[PDB]
Amino acid sequence: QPKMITISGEQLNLITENKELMNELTLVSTELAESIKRETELEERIRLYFSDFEKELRKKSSKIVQLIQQLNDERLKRFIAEEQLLLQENGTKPSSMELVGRIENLNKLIDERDSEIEML
């Protein structure tokens, strides 16, 4: 609902698409967070009840994509520094920030309840 635009061509066929995968990447990630925690609820569960030449390379494969993740996280989090700065620049007081923020999280809860209207 916050997207405006009317023609612009195939770009709306691109930007309404890229919003999907954004509003769907947080779905796979939070519904995987609810999965990983439970392993500990089974791991911590266990205590009250392999190969070393490849244990490393099955974690080095996971360590590497944690080097690129951290690097990617930061250079992007600074991409929000200036562009939030220029907004607090081009605006001055009562944040349009927290409004569009608390607006977007509101669609989610609708989008997390309207889906249930269709589950029922």
Partner 1 sequence: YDEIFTENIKLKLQVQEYETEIESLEKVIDMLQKNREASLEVV
By CB under 8 A, the residues from 35 to 74 that bind a second copy are: 35-36, 38-40, 42-43, 45-46, 49-51, 53-56, 58-63, 65-74
**Per-position b or e across 34-59, b if 16+ CB within 10 A of its CB:** eeeeeeeeeeeeeeeeeeeeeeeeee
Read off φ and ψ for residue 40, nearest 5 degrees: -65, -40
Binding residue (CB under 8 A) for partner 1 from 73, 104, 111, 112: 73
Sign of the alpha-carbon dihedral angle for 52, 60, 33, 16: negative
38 is a site residue for partner 1 (CB under 8 A): no
Binding partner at 83 among partner 1, a second copy, none, C-beta below 5 to 8 Å by kind = a second copy
Read off φ and ψ for residue 89, nearest 5 degrees: -75, -70
Query: Contact residues for partner 1 (CB under 8 A)?
Result: 50, 52, 54-57, 59-60, 63, 66-67, 70-71, 73-75, 77-78, 81-82, 84-86, 88-89, 92-93
